Design a binder for this molecule. Structure first.
Ligand SMILES: NC(=O)c1ccc[n+]([C@@H]2O[C@H](COP(=O)([O-])OP(=O)(O)OC[C@H]3O[C@@H](n4cnc5c(N)ncnc54)[C@H](OP(=O)(O)O)[C@@H]3O)[C@@H](O)[C@H]2O)c1
Ligand SMILES: NC(=O)c1ccc[n+]([C@@H]2O[C@H](COP(=O)([O-])OP(=O)(O)OC[C@H]3O[C@@H](n4cnc5c(N)ncnc54)[C@H](OP(=O)(O)O)[C@@H]3O)[C@@H](O)[C@H]2O)c1
Ligand SMILES: NC(=O)c1ccc[n+]([C@@H]2O[C@H](COP(=O)([O-])OP(=O)(O)OC[C@H]3O[C@@H](n4cnc5c(N)ncnc54)[C@H](OP(=O)(O)O)[C@@H]3O)[C@@H](O)[C@H]2O)c1
Ligand SMILES: NC(=O)c1ccc[n+]([C@@H]2O[C@H](COP(=O)([O-])OP(=O)(O)OC[C@H]3O[C@@H](n4cnc5c(N)ncnc54)[C@H](OP(=O)(O)O)[C@@H]3O)[C@@H](O)[C@H]2O)c1
Lengths: 249, 250, 249, 249
């Protein structure tokens, strides 16, 4: 459809929001490349998607992996029209219990990996290509034990504002999708190792959304598709928040 | 392509500019569109240019009786509203120390008060799962000389959506805001002055302020509204979507 | 004595935040004028404040009252260094029950009166004068049945951004203090006429503040005093939020 | 003498904003500790301030240096009422020229050292203490070649929102001062080694401010002193922007 004839790269495409986004973009006719660290999930994701979705085992935090990943895109497709820097995660640590590892792990995948994924992608991206970063409402709010994650997500949104000007000559527009609480494996894992612990954590998080439910991952993916499509032609540097109103109220 | 087919949309101020293009894009997606304007002549041209089962009503959003008349027509003609775009609005310039009571009253009556009662009057028609789009501006979040009244009215519109999220939770109607940057429109051109050379230097100057360096086509604003009108925005509530070429984002 | 010799006007100085702000400004050496609609409360306020505080009975919504008040300042003090457009209020109406009177009254006092207080004040204000607008966190947040008040307070804050450029030649800086929930007569009145209803509503509102208490008006007054002093020389068009962290999280 | 009886630590106290803040904090009666990497300026800073201002040669990025610094405060002063995490910097790299070191250097000092400066200080801080983090308007704006610096500053602001909830039991309030363009050595250095290159950039930066001048470091310092004082008791998680209206407009 609108994305037909377009080449899309979704980092962290093997599960959750990155998975649903790869599905939606491909359903619009785009050629999608997805990345994951675990070979088994990547193979299941490629098989579940079908529709000419290409899988590459890559770690966004490893600079050499990014070089290899973009080489496969250059060798096969030869261009990148859509980039969704989805690969990221959250971990909880209250102030007074923040380890250097906890800080470094969050920033390397949530922020550093975003910077160098984007910088490496650029030679492939033509004029009028679209870049989508994954933010969070936690980037604009405060939650106990979430300061490090929240700071990383705020850093992500901040990158898009300056990159508007850095990429103005090349004609690529960069925007941010900031999801609210989305039903994923990653969100469930915060609730615990136990199944009641993940079930009760998802239920409390749902109770925080004003419409009263968690998002299905497809609901975030529609937002990425919109930014990937030509309809977003006048959107640049913007944050689109789909949170059921949680951070809007 | 029939994305909004079977849905009923109302665009206040549908006869020109952003409202016109939005009515077009909604109709191109299969929606039944109702448009309003103050001038019957432009309204007739707009309805004729759109075709596609677009119904026109001449009404002023600032007149409470017109709003009652307009929604009575929707109730008999279609019997429901699924999409509402409170586009009718305008900007005027007056610096602090030159602000007239006229200038304040007109700006807030159309830009804010009419938005409240357009929305309030439309609620009985709107079913669960309906989408409301208010027309903001980046000027609601920025400062420009001689624009304090317009910018303040636009900030008020965005604020209304945050509380209306909670007010409309039981009915299931979601409220969002599109904040345009500089979009080429008769409205925007007329801000430059009333002479023809004067409007072009204003349109070119406004383009020079945009980071991508061009004014928006009205259709590019309309695509954001259609997205908000469609079910793809199902998890968006109370949010502001800014399409400004990055002007207010930097 | 940061305000020694400075002339300050607090509209709606007879109760709550405006009263404590007048008390605080005078305690720093300012010459303070306060206004109120009710003659009895105004006289009581002037007597309690002492410290050379002058009261004028005037309504911010009546243009002729606005002319008469500023004529007294020109005749008496001869200039105006600090302006606090405090006179304001909140009323409740959900969508579907908003009357035209509820809208008009809210916007006339909270927005229109702010505009014309400022514009009429300008001829008395010298270069380096300070203008403080009274915002609210409700201007940036969502609360049920508060849409009209919330929009008026957002309008107030936006006025400041443009007034930076309008007043740059005159040399006046405009800033906003946005209070969170502050224990005042006006706020208690939202709780009801009964004392038990005021006790439950204020305690509930206190539970929403992350620090867990309502502000005393003196805590808001300090923010105004800071903005009025020369310490705010590089602050212009900004919003200073004293909410105990409520809208910050 | 509002801050008299209070112990203040300013990282990066030997020059610029941190120096002016150390001056202003000490002028209010606080016992001030300043840190710098270079012994020479740290000695010049301590001697120029006088007023019992104590200097420690420490690097905020060195965990061992931080440990020693707080040990001297615990051994000498014994408590910390005010924390200003000022030590930080900007460097420019446009997208396509961002080095991995440039990212790491920026985020080490501006974000990581802030996290661990605060975490190590906490055991010394009594209930009612005030923490001030140093942001920037660039954390909320976009400038060509400034994405990493802006992203670091946006992360600082996000840290305060969550830290409000983390520190609520301790009763320590966290706020952020976000300066606009301030006349400092660091700002001049962005104009490069050449003298007229530094003058030409600084006047250009002054032209970007709506009031049309750069801030003196004392104007930012007044904001910090206000947040350090008890006058800010109802401010928590807030950002106070002193930018001459640049990001406000
Ligand atoms: N879910 C929410 O509520 C929410 C809210 C706001 C923002 N977000 C953001 O949305 C993004 C997706 O979150 P999610 O909930 O969908 O997570 P998820 O369910 O855990 O899925 C994460 C995906 O990323 C992949 N991945 C993880 N680390 C990677 C790495 N270093 N390199 C490459 N691929 C990697 C994972 O596969 P492997 O583990 O095999 O690598 C998996 O495919 C994240 O950036 C997250 O912070 C989520
Ligand atoms: N264009 C921009 O750059 C820009 C930027 C930000 C926000 N906006 C907002 O976008 C909306 C559209 O602006 P625009 O530039 O497209 O304006 P425009 O070119 O002047 O078009 C305005 C439309 O609204 C109608 N209208 C005006 N007053 C009305 C009233 N009282 N009742 C009913 N219809 C009314 C006009 O028809 P009649 O004259 O016949 O009544 C016309 O159809 C406004 O709310 C504006 O504030 C525009
Ligand atoms: N309290 C809060 O939690 C809170 C939070 C955010 C913002 N605010 C804002 O803070 C401001 C003060 O609120 P408050 O709680 O202190 O209110 P309050 O206790 O009701 O005091 C309001 C004061 O304004 C005067 N006043 C009202 N309307 C006036 C008019 N038209 N002309 C002249 N004087 C007028 C009142 O006296 P008369 O009745 O005698 O005229 C009284 O002196 C308002 O703008 C309010 O919206 C308050
Ligand atoms: N100036 C502005 O316009 C502006 C605007 C927005 C934000 N800011 C922020 O304000 C803060 C101060 O900037 P400034 O212009 O005052 O800078 P500056 O003139 O360069 O002063 C920086 C001070 O920090 C010290 N310092 C630097 N790195 C350090 C480290 N690793 N450990 C300990 N001390 C260290 C420096 O001494 P040594 O070099 O000897 O260590 C010096 O005393 C920074 O966070 C900056 O990002 C400044």
């Amino acid at each position: 459809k609108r994305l037909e004839g377009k080449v899309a790269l979704v980092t962290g495409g093997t599960s959750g929001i990155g998975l649903a986004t790869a599905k939606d973009l491909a359903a619009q006719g785009a050629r999608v490349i997805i990345t994951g660290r675990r070979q088994a999930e990547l193979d299941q994701a490629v098989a579940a998607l079908g529709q000419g979705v290409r899988g590459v085992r890559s770690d966004v935090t490893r600079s050499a992996d990014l070089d290899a990943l973009f080489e496969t895109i250059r060798a096969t497709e030869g261009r990148l029209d859509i980039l969704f820097t989805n690969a990221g995660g959250a971990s909880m640590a209250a102030l007074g219990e923040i380890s250097e590892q906890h800080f470094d792990d969050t920033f390397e995948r949530n922020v550093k990996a975003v910077v160098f994924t984007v910088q490496k992608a650029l030679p492939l991206m033509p004029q009028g290509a679209s870049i989508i970063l994954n933010g969070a409402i936690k980037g604009s709010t405060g939650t106990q034990a979430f300061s490090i994650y929240g700071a990383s997500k705020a850093a992500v949104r901040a990158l898009a504002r300056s990159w508007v000007l850095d990429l103005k000559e090349r004609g690529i527009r960069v925007n941010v999708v900031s999801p609210g609480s989305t039903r994923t494996i990653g969100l469930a894992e915060l609730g615990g190792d136990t199944q009641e612990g993940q079930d009760g954590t998802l239920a409390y998080l749902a109770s925080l959304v004003p419409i009263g439910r968690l998002a299905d991952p497809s609901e975030i993916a529609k937002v990425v598709s919109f930014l990937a499509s030509d309809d977003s032609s006048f959107i640049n540097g913007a944050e689109i928040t789909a949170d059921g109103g949680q951070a809007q109220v």
